[PDB]
Structure 1
Amino acid sequence: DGTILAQKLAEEVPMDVASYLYTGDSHQLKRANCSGRYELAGLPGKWPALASAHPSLHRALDTLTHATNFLNVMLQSNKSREQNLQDDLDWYQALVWSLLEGEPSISRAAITFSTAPQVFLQATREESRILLQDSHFKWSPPYLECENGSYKPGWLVTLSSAIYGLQPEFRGVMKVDINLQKVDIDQCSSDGWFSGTHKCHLNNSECMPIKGLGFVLGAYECICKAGFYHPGVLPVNNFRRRGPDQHISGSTKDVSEEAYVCLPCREGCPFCADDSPCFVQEDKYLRLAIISFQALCMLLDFVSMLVVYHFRKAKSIRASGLILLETILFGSLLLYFPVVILYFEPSTFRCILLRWARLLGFATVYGTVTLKLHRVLKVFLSRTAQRIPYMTGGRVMRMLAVILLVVFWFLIGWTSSVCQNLEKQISLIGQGKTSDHLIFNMCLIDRWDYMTAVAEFLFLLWGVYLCYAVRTVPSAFHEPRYMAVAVHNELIISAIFHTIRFVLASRLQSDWMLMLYFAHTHLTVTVTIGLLLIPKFSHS
């Protein structure tokens, strides 16, 4: 409301808004009336003595105070004839002369002393003569000399006092014309004189709510109407920075007197450009040819669960067993959620579940392959001695529950110990640095990933020794020959992947960490269920 009142008053007084914008103005054109009786004056009503426009105003009021006090003293003096003789009238000239020779900026001052006017006046400071014509420190609005045309003066005020006489009041006043030209024109904020507390072009109405900490003022807000002087305060035009966000500085359009959008240069970073900087564009033509192929090989794996169920009466599946063949086949679905979870975005619950699907999908697929490969050695070796008929799931799914109890215990402890530092430090989401000064959101390794990448390497060495003990064991379907490739293959292309994933942990873009999780799970997982399932229906 305060800003718009000045806008209306600009056209409420013609040919004066140019005088506000340019302090010269009258130097170029001068043909008008005695304009400028009062414009905005004191937007908060009026300032008695406040707003501290320099110390000139206060000291002028003070000198007027203890200069009219002088006449207020020679009021109750007895036997005061006051003949107004030649010497007596020269008494009154001295005070008016002294009223000018103690202040930096001051203009004509006059006294009525109506007993017969006996009005005395003087000219401006340091150059004034004498000319005779023929309450409680009231104030006056800005002014401009009415004489003829407009001239330079610059809205001089007419602060005046009153004189009371004894016998009512004297019908006399004391005029002081303060020169207000070379005076700082407020600061367009921080409530003072004629620019009251907002009084500019949209500090916060356009650029502040969206752009936190706008700082549109600096030292002079929206630099406003002005017109008095150009002091050393350095009017800060378009000082709003506010860092980034929707509203930046405003160096796009709407600049000079008419100044408004200041809304641009906002994309992810404290910069000013298009969406070239950080938050690199995620290619959508490559992320839709992977998740759509990761879910076509996932539903082609759930369909294969029904097929073996329908073929459970065959001579090739009865030997392996229906319960030890779908434990492998169901645990390979948990190995297909390195990519569906890494695709969306890094998060806290979305990065804890990454470790719950890799450690439980490994103890189920490769934790029972080495158990039915351990059976083959122990059955032949001990039946060469004769007895101990071994059994199917119930003595091998009972030895697997122990493996799934040590790994299920670690996950509970690790999850509980990782959702505790969140009150102090969150390491589940980090940031990276590229060559071209670009940053992406990833998951940070917490030194519990180099040790669960050795437990997978030490557990697969037990399946390597068993592949040598069954090297000369006759078999009907050569199954121990396909369970030996699937262990020597998982062992090799999983140590290489972890080494690449650990060394190049911060130099891999988020779009390049799903072309490595997609070439891993399709060279170790898809060739494991392609070796344990294909030589069961055909090629018997």
Structure 2
Amino acid sequence: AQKLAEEVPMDVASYLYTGDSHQLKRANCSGRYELAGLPGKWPALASAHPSLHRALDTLTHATNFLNVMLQSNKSREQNLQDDLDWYQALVWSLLEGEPSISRAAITFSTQVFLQATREESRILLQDLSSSAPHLANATLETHFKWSPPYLECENGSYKPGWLVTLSSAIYGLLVPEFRGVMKVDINLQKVDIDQCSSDGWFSGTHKCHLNNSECMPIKGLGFVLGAYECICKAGFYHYVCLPCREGCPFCADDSPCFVQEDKYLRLAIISFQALCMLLDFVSMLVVYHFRKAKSIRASGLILLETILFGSLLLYFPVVILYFEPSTFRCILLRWARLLGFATVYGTVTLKLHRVLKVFLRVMRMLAVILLVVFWFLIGWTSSVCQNLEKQISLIGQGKTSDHLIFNMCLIDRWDYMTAVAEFLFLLWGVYLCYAVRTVPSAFHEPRYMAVAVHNELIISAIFHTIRFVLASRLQSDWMLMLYFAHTHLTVTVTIGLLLIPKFS
């Protein structure tokens, strides 16, 4: 409607859309404009500047004045002596009242009329029909007469200004009739208009509807189009308002907000991780086949398969942290860590305790610490889920280093003291191995395990250290190498020292 309604006035669209001197400084008009529909629905001073009210006020004052005056009894029609002076001074003061009332006429015949227009400072006035006086439209009516914006031209180029008129028909004086027509016209061209108003002058926000849309319009200049600036709300800007590439505002570009990946790297990483877990399972089967010469008695078949189930319980964290951080990730992480940890190293150290008694009842020591670890997962798990899944803190976090973003599983002071557990439960065995210093068998099994223990203490301490130190400025790739590296190092090691000799 409004869009198709723009193909209305040729050599005026510069005066309409640009509101420009192309249709004004040089464009043959030979006709005044007409807002009888080029306005809003009708605004009728319901969508009003105050100036409308001021104009109507002076109008109605003069209207009542002349009506009651003409309603004076015995209407003489005495236009001879001085009544002409009264009407002349009246129209002078009239057009002198409004600084933007350009021309105005007043006719009274119960063809000739008084008129005046602002030349520079005086009311260029003469007893001749001018400004406005529509006896024709008053007879057609046979209230006041609203009017239309215009242009300073009837058979000429439309000069500066677009003229909106106010007009009325002089009610006569014991009945009434049409006895005159008085009307003025003011410049409806320096009149601020609103394309994005809720209701205004034919407000159409046809530049920013929804697509990250806001209209932050150009408020008051005058009767000019293209005066409704729009804003591109939280996305890109290339009359283009666009989204972001992601839920990541400040999209001066539509660039991405995440780290660059190294997928090809990650494939082989995971494959090699499966390699080690394959070796784990495989060697468990190796055990359950070849169980009948020295190793079987000195080293429990049971206790071996314990350790391997440990390693297979253990290697998960890697395959985890290739995948994305959901909160359900982090918890499995804590699960696998502590379970593989205790389940292996308990049996390890207990063998040595038994050795030490031979110097001078296994599982009824081990199931204890497995118990305590069960308890722990439960306690901490519930204390985060039931009471912190929703309320206060967030675990899976989108943390940013510098330009980019990355998700990750986060920490808590809990896992600090957990690492410290690792410290001490090894350090026991370390005391153990040290003072048990010279003690025989055809294996140097104690030297083997003691090696494991010194290894893991120093090195798993380090791994936990270099994760907790600077996690808040990590990418999601350097970390993975860390996990891969330390777990392969220490634990493939601590497999091999036990398994290697027990073939040859």
TM-score (norm 2): 0.81
After superposition, the C-alpha distances for 1:500-520 in whole angstroms (9 at most, x for unaligned) are 222233233221111111111
Give the equivalent residue in structure 2 for 1:388: none
Query: Contact (CA 8 Å) 2:106, 2:115: kept in 1 or not?
Result: no
Shift of 1:473: 3.2
SS in 1 for 2:213: coil
Q: Quote how far apart the aligned CAs of 1:325 are.
A: 1.2
Question: CA distance change for structure 1 residues 280 and 164 in 2, over 3 Å: closer, same or farther?
Answer: same
The equivalent residue for 1:250 is none
Moved more, 18-27 or 510-519: 18-27
User: Contact 1:432/1:439 (CA < 8 Å) preserved in 2?
Assistant: yes
**1:144-164 superposed Cα distances (whole Å, 9 cap, x missing partner):** 244223322432112212332
- The answer to whether the Cα contact below 8 Å between 2:219 and 2:227 also exists between their aligned partners in 1 is no
1:497-516 alignment, distance < 5 Å: 497-516=463-482
Measure the CA separation in 2 of the matches of 1:221 and 1:403. Answer: 70
- Alpha carbons of 1:488 and 1:200: their partners in 2 closer, same or farther (altered >3 Å)? closer
For residues 236 and 264 of structure 2, what CA distance do their matches in structure 1 show? 63
Rounded to whole Å, the distance in 1 between the matches of 2:234 and 2:358 is 101
Q: Which residue of 2 aligns with 1:391?
A: none
Query: 2-side partners of 1:311 and 1:272: how far apart?
Result: 64
Which has the higher mean CA deviation after the structures are superposed, 169-178 or 206-215? Answer: 206-215
Deviates more, 1:286-295 or 1:439-448: 439-448
CA deviation string 1:106-153 (max 9, x = no partner): 1211122122xx532433336588899999233122222442233224
Residues 348, 177 of structure 1: alpha-carbon distance in 2 compared, 3 angstrom cutoff: same
Report the CA distance between 1:226 and its aligned residue.
Answer: 28
The answer as to whether partners of 1:96 and 1:122 remain within 8 angstroms in 2 is yes
Corresponding residue for 2:322?
Answer: 343
Structure 1 stretch displaced more, 130-139 or 465-474: 130-139
SS in structure 1 at match of 2:21: helix
| Structure 1 residues 190 and 311: alpha-carbon distance in aligned structure 2, compared to 1, 3 A threshold | same
Paired residues of 2:31 and 2:154 also in contact (CA < 8 A): no
On the 8 A contact 1:370/1:463 being kept in 2, the answer is yes
Distance of 1:367 and 1:421 partners within structure 2: 33
Give the one of 458, 477, 484 matched to 1:492: 458
Q: In the alignment, is the contact (CA less than 8 A) between 1:183 and 1:228 conserved in 2?
A: no
> Is contact 2:288-2:301 (8 Å) kept?
yes
- What per-residue deviation string (whole Å, max 9, x for no partner) do you get for residues 151-202 of structure 1? 2243211221233225342153221111122221335423211334657788
Contact 1:51–1:192 under 8 Å retained in 2: no
CA, structure 1 residues 223+324, in 2 after alignment: closer, same or farther (shift >3 Å)?
closer
Structure 2 Cα separation of the partners of residues 535 and 227 of structure 1: 64
Q: Matched residue pairs, number?
A: 488
Deviation of residue 60 (structure 1)? 0.8
SS of the equivalent of 1:64 reads: helix
- Cα-to-partner distance string for 1:251-297 (whole Å, 9 max, x where unaligned): xxxxxxxxx43337746654456687752212223322312211222
What is the DSSP-based 3-state SS (H/G/I as helix, E as strand, rest coil) of the residue aligned with 1:452?
helix
Q: 1:197 to 1:478 in 2, by over 3 A?
A: closer
Determine if contact 1:159/1:177 at 8 Å carries over to the other structure. Answer: yes
- Asked if structure 1 preserves the Cα contact closer than 8 Å seen for 2:105 and 2:182, the reply is yes
TM-fit CA distance, 1:398: 2.6
Kept after mapping to 2: 8 A contact 1:119/1:132: no
Give the structure with the higher percent strand: 2
Distance in 2 (alpha carbons) for counterparts of 1:228 and 1:298: 47
Alignment of 1:200-211 (within 5 A): none
**CA shift in 2, pair 1:167/1:469, >3 Å:** closer
Cα 1:128/1:274, change in 2 over 3 Å: closer
Deviations 1:323-372 (Å, cap 9, x if unpaired)? 21111100112221221112212231111222111111111111211112
Q: Which deviates more, 485-494 or 299-308?
A: 299-308
Partners of 1:370 and 1:36 in 2: CA distance: 107
Distance in structure 2 (CA, Å) of the matches to 1:228 and 1:282: 24
Deviation at 1:410, TM superposition (A): 1.7
Q: Answer yes or no: is the 8 Å Cα contact 1:207–1:263 preserved in 2.
A: no
- Equivalent residue for 1:233? none
In structure 1, the gaps of 5 or more residues are: 1-5, 230-259, 382-394
**Residues 7 and 488 (structure 1), Cα distance of their counterparts in 2 relative to 1, 3 Å cut:** same
Confirm or deny: 8 A CA contact 1:110 1:174 kept in the other structure: yes
Q: Counterparts of 1:365 and 1:337 in 2: how far apart (Å)?
A: 15
Question: Would the aligned equivalents of 1:22 and 1:227 in 2 still touch at CA under 8 Å?
Answer: no
Q: Look up the SS of the partner of 1:172 in the other structure.
A: strand
Q: Secondary structure at the match of 2:182?
A: strand
Of 292, 299, 324, the match for 1:313: 292
Give how far 1:405 is off.
Answer: 1.0
Displacement of 1:71 after TM fit?
1.8
Identity %: 100
The offset of 1:476, in angstroms, is 4.4
Cα pair 1:291 1:339 within 8 Å, conserved: yes
1:457/1:491 contact within 8 Å kept = yes
CA-to-partner distance for each residue in 1:207-228, whole Å, 9 max, x for gaps? 9999999999999345999999
Deviations 1:457-504 (A, max 9, x none): 111122112224543333244433322222221111112222222223
User: Paired residue for 1:384?
Assistant: none
Q: Mark the CA change 1:35 to 1:300 in structure 2 (over 3 Å): closer, same or farther.
A: farther
Offset of residue 415 of structure 1: 1.4
Check 1:272–1:167 CA distance in 2 against 1; reply closer, same or farther (3 A cut): closer
C-alpha root-mean-square deviation of aligned residues, in Å?
5.6
Q: Which shows bigger deviation, 106-115 or 79-88?
A: 79-88
Instruction: Give SS of 1:30's match.
Output: coil
Give 2:492's aligned residue.
Answer: 526
* Counterpart-to-counterpart distance in 1, 2:261 and 2:218: 26
Question: Structure 1's 496 and 473: CA in aligned 2 closer, same or farther, altered over 3 A?
Answer: same
* Structure 2: runs of 5+ lacking an equivalent: 128-141
CA positional deviation for 1:403? 0.6
Cα distance change, pair 200–351 in 1 and its aligned pair in 2 (3 A): closer
Which of 402, 413, 417 does residue 451 from structure 1 map onto? 417
Distance 1:203 1:119 in 2: 60
| Higher deviation after alignment, 522-531 or 44-53 | 44-53
1:67 & 1:396 partners in 2: Cα distance? Answer: 115
Evaluate the alpha carbon distance shift between residue 412 and residue 58 of structure 1 in structure 2; reply closer, same or farther with a 3 A threshold: same
Conserved 8 A contact 1:108-1:177: yes
Aligned-partner Cα distance in 1 for 2:286–2:236: 92
Change (3 A) 1:102 1:415: same
- Range with bigger deviation, 216-225 or 457-466: 216-225
Which deviates more from structure 2 when the two are superposed, residues 96-105 or residues 362-371? Answer: 96-105
Q: Which moved more, 1:296-305 or 1:421-430?
A: 421-430
Contact 1:431–1:441 (Cα < 8 Å) also in 2: yes
Offset at residue 32 of structure 1 (A)? 6.9
- Mean alpha-carbon deviation: is it higher for 61-70 or for 215-224? 215-224
CA contact (8 A) 1:185 1:228 kept: no
Does the residue aligned with 2:46 lie in a helix, a strand or coil? coil
Decide whether aligned partners of structure 1 residues 106 and 44 sit closer, same or farther in structure 2, where only a CA change above 3 A counts.
closer
1:142 aligned counterpart, secondary structure: coil
1:430, CA displacement in angstroms?
6.9
For structure 1, which segment, 59-68 or 23-32, has the greater mean C-alpha deviation from structure 2 after superposition? 23-32
C-alpha displacement at 1:80, in angstroms? 2.4
Say if 1:208 and 1:218 are closer, same or farther in 2 by CA, change over 3 A.
same
